[PDB]
């Protein structure tokens, strides 16, 4: 009798909970996408500036520090799927 | 008898769970705030550098690449509520 | 009789749920680590560019705007445990 009504009501309550958790897991999955994207933007923004200076008539020492700096920055960025713009040397 | 004691104890246990989930949802909400802020900082940091170069005596080609670069960066930043500093052209 | 079988089955179901939540909490903890790291990278990338310009033969006004800019950027970065490279002024 009352055991079975209770069992089914448990099951609904747990379902709702799993709904809540799953909804948090998908948001934790969006955020981790948002973090990757933030990193990708900063990465492209910083290389974008470096390459703008590199393609100009800048002194030879600043070219050394900027190339080196491009690697360090690029090293810190573990590995995201970057796609730096075509470039523009001529 | 023992059905009712069991029902109330279920209800407490579920409450605690919903407490845990709600506490995760508020942290997922802080992080999404933290991500926006990280993006805003990188955005302001990169425009800050670009505008420092733009207001100086830099070559005319570097000015072209930097203005263009300011848009691309600003385009990648979907739309955050930016507030770039007043500027400083004179 | 059937009350006790039901009680134990509740306990397993709740355990599984707490497992799920705890697994979300550790991921919310990784993301908050990932956000800090994204901020640290952008921070180092932007100071890296600024210091490359600062150590060169740049005009005196651009040096003013860049030093100032280094503080504003560094101020916006609440306080992360930064570790800017040794520097390189000579
Ligand atoms: Cl220059």
- Separation between Cα atoms, residue A49 and residue A75, nearest integer Å: 17
Kindly state the tokens that stand for A20.
Answer: 């809540």
- Separation between Cα atoms, residue C23 and residue C86, nearest integer Å: 39
Q: How many domains does chain A have?
A: 1
Decide if C48 is inside a domain.
Answer: yes
Q: What is the DSSP string of C39-84?
A: HHHHHHHHHHHHHHHHTSS--HHHHHHHHHHHHHHHHHSTT-----
Decide if A10 is inside a domain.
Answer: yes
Decide if C83 is inside a domain.
Answer: no
Decide if B15 is inside a domain.
Answer: yes
Whether B40 and A39 have beta carbons less than 8 Å apart is answered as: no
Nearby residues of C54 by Cβ (< 8 Å), 6 or more positions away: C63, C66, C67
Decide if C57 is inside a domain.
Answer: yes
Q: For chain B, say whether A52 makes contact (Cβ under 8 Å).
A: yes
Report the gap between the CA of C39 and the closest CA in chain B (Å).
6
Name the resolution in angstroms: 2.4
Report the gap between the CA of B17 and the closest CA in chain A (Å).
8
Burial (0-12, 13-18, 19+ Cβ within 10 Å), A25: middle
Q: For chain B, say whether C54 makes contact (Cβ under 8 Å).
A: no
Nearest to A32, CA basis, from C24, B34, C35, B42: C35
Decide if C20 is inside a domain.
Answer: yes
Decide if B33 is inside a domain.
Answer: yes
- Separation between Cα atoms, residue B38 and residue B35, nearest integer Å: 5
Closest-CA residue of chain A to B34: A35
Q: For chain A, say whether B82 makes contact (Cβ under 8 Å).
A: no
Decide if B88 is inside a domain.
Answer: no
Structural domain including C72 reads: 2-76
Which chain B residues are Cβ-neighbours of C73 within 8 angstroms? 41, 44-45, 48
Whether B86 and B47 have beta carbons less than 8 Å apart is answered as: no
Chains adjacent to A (≥3 CB pairs closer than 8 angstroms): B, C
Query: Cα dihedral angle (C70, C74, C76, C81), rounded to 10 degrees?
Result: 160
């Amino acid at each position: 009798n009352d055991i079975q009504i209770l069992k089914s009501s448990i099951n609904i309550a747990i379902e709702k909970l799993n709904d809540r958790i799953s909804h948090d897991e998908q948001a934790i999955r969006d955020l981790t996408l948002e973090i990757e994207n933030a990193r990708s933007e900063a990465l492209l923004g910083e290389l974008g500036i470096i390459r703008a200076l590199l393609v100009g008539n800048i002194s030879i020492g600043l070219q050394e520090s900027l190339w080196e700096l491009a690697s360090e920055i690029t090293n810190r960025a573990g590995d995201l799927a970057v796609e730096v713009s075509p470039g523009s040397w001529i």
